[PDB]
Design an enzyme around this catalytic site. Structure first.
Site, short mmCIF file in Angstrom:
data_model
loop_
_atom_site.label_atom_id
_atom_site.label_comp_id
_atom_site.label_asym_id
_atom_site.label_seq_id
_atom_site.Cartn_x
_atom_site.Cartn_y
_atom_site.Cartn_z
N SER A 1 0.85 -1.19 0.00
CA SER A 1 0.00 0.00 0.00
C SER A 1 0.90 1.25 0.00
CB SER A 1 -0.86 0.02 1.27
OG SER A 1 -1.62 1.22 1.35
N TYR B 1 -1.57 -0.74 10.47
CA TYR B 1 -1.68 -1.06 9.04
C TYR B 1 -0.42 -0.62 8.28
CZ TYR B 1 -3.48 -1.30 4.22
OH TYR B 1 -3.65 -1.61 2.88
#
Ligand SMILES: [K+]
Ligand SMILES: [K+]
Ligand SMILES: [K+]
Ligand SMILES: [K+]
Lengths: 260, 260, 259, 260
Positions: free
Chosen positions: C144, C158
């Site tokens: 990501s 995350y």
């Protein structure tokens, strides 16, 4: 010892009379170093240079310098070594940032930015190679920018090229100069409050600050203090770095991520 | 229906008759695109251009171009649009890599590398702005290098500066051109086997290969296949990237980390 | 045929929805054998039927808990048993719940690391033998922008996990290179998924205003890059982290987004 | 007015009794700060306290701490605040680096490295949030590594994952903590001369040093001096940075590029 002692240093700051360069010169002057404040025309700001002369025990002088001119770089290095007896810290700080979109940027506009910001950096370092080497503890500090290495900004693709070029130069220069004891590092300022930007008002300023996690614009001495640290004996194993000073500006993913 | 179709593309490859540029032209030619292969003097290698003409259904031609000359860039773009009826992919690939240590590098040596490698890249993209915009799916692919953005190599500080400069340019240019549908990306080749390198013998080649996890030097088509992918409709959301093609060369921490 | 994937056998973890489904879809269209893995048997039979008619390869659904090493081993065995090979692995599965640093519990932190990091490692490890046997093995990690590039309050766990995948890659690429396996990562920016469509067009247009390309990406944008990285033609590319974001990470500030 | 004054700071250093952590604790102790050194084992705690207590005007304490345990982290922060009346700098430095090839690495080996190196970092910072916030000038400094963020090394894919994870954590944590006046930065040591490397002998050390442009391995105080700078009031606009301290190790393109 005194930790982070700079009182035995002899420093050249290009574009030193204004903005970020003046912040860099201010910190070295307060730390007791010899400081040569270079400008295209030093006499325009000689009261600034004289003021720096009061801040610490070192000698502070102005020197004239057109960084894009390799002969002018060589004259200035010579002047500084004659003046101080040494030159062991070089802050290649001079640069310009005129605006031009890609669909109108002329060959002359592109060349001017590359001449000052890239060639000016290379020539400044080259002119000072001998005293940097002789010192045993030489320090090269480049003023780059977030624009180019990290971000883009329509109207500044030449500026960004030039600021990223300084880092590509650094990654080889650091290797060439390491066996001579010279480190080569870069500082990448984000949004810094300069004299020019102040005369635009608290609404325009705090507008910009809204995108910055720390909640304010930086100051010239924020850049100066990092440069001072990099120049110390204690930073002798740090080389080839590109250190961003931006209050976290480049971190948030989007406007909604700026504030918790 | 056909995945990664390039048969409707019209491509300009600068420095396309040799080395990496010839690898890029070859792949586009095989993919059925129109390909203009640009060179300082195309006639020197017209047999290469003729052979490319046989690889697919597209028109392949030579075009003369001095990338450092903004007028030459404008002439070549006009020639290519007249030839093909479009110009929707530009591979700004041309670049030189002469050697100069910082202690001997002359103003003329520094300028020549920046003129060809940086200005040549900017002028090439600028000359092609109108047809890139007109296509609605424009593609700009820059040939940079690991040297500068990632690594250093004594003797190539000016080359490294120029290769990193391409990326700083890209990060703004990608923003300027995005709303016109144009992507701007760069490929950073590692050690690629070209004609020159072949002559130097299997033992010298095998020696370089030992530092590369994959165990061999790359080929020009490794670069060409990535350029081809970036040019597809399927790559329309990728922009501002700097993708290293090096068989993992830049990964190992030291010589003992190269092989498990 | 340039970029031929018709001889490949592909495992995609988290393959029944969003980005994972986009990856599976592109490989299926390219003629590869495709195994999609998930926890839900219902999502499996549904996506398997969808993918089954897209090309000439075979498609299977596989039950998988990526955080469980034994489940990962079972999946690789199941895939090899069905296809006779496993030469592309898309380690795509991941979760992204929110937790601010002052409230984040040990359970919240641990779960994100178990699924996103350990799940990635166990998936690759379970596939080492068939990847190696192929001579042209391909590992593609779904990371990501959040972590490797950006920050986002609520997502420090995350971000840590997505950056962890890249740290893992930079060594794994070296261990696997002499076996002919490449190991690369894709870093999606803002991709239009089901949960975003449900927000409505005003919400989406508001996000798109920060993106130079002027729109959100598509799951097949990730799928097409994964497909390219899997080809024989990408055999000299390893250890890369490629951002797919329409230029979202480039502008310096809101005013820099549009010329 | 002392530039870079740290005499008013209260500092927690995790894994502070040996190696790099000890170099960090030693620099802060010399600068006159209150220093709490933490270790999993209580063994070295009394002795390090007597040894460091000598170096400057601040007080030094030893704290027993298991960073992987949230309650142990909370106890440590409480102990520090009770002793010093404040906790305004946390150096989350504890980490382990056992070797495990990908083909043999167990769930237990992977989990232990993530628990100590990643969760240990998160829990350390979390336990210190309240006093960091109360100070108005809070500082978080993470010890990461070149291995993971930059380089690969067969046998350390779990270690590299853990060190990169710290930076992914940082890029968000720096945003969450900025409006509270807390900066969050990371140092990435390259090859630093520790006890274990000394025990390998000079030939081994010389072999490693030949890959380093600077020509020698670094020392724990190189890390400690950078940590000290980051902790100053003067570094208040620097956040989210990952700064490599490696003597140029990650720069050369190949073995032939290390020396000019
Ligand atoms: K003075
Ligand atoms: K043809
Ligand atoms: K089928
Ligand atoms: K003391």
């Amino acid at each position: 010892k005194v930790m982070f002692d700079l009182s035995a240093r002899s420093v050249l700051v290009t574009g030193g009379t204004k903005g970020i360069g003046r912040g860099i010169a201010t910190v070295f002057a307060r730390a007791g170093a010899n400081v040569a404040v270079a400008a295209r025309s030093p006499r325009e700001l000689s009261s600034v240079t004289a003021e720096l002369g009061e801040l610490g025990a070192g000698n502070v002088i102005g020197v004239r310098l057109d960084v894009s001119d390799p002969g002018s770089c060589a004259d200035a290095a010579r002047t500084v070594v004659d003046a101080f007896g040494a030159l062991d810290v070089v802050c290649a700080n001079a640069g310009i940032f005129p605006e031009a979109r890609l669909d109108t940027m002329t060959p002359e506009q592109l060349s001017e930015v590359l001449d000052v910001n890239v060639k000016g950096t290379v020539y400044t370092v080259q002119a000072c190679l001998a005293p940097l080497t002789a010192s045993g503890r030489g320090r090269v500090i480049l003023t780059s920018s977030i624009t180019g290495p990290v971000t883009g900004y329509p109207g500044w693709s030449h500026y960004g090229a030039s600021k990223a070029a300084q880092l590509g130069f650094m990654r080889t220069a650091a290797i060439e100069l390491a066996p001579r004891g010279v480190t080569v590092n870069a500082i990448l300022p984000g949004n810094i409050l300069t004299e020019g930007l102040v005369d635009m008002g608290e609404e325009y300023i705090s507008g910009m600050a809204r995108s910055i996690p720390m909640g304010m614009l930086g100051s010239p001495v924020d850049i100066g203090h990092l440069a001072a640290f990099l120049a110390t004996d204690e930073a002798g194993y740090i080389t080839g770095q590109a250190i961003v000073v931006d209050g976290g500006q480049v971190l948030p993913e989007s406007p909604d991520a700026v504030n918790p």
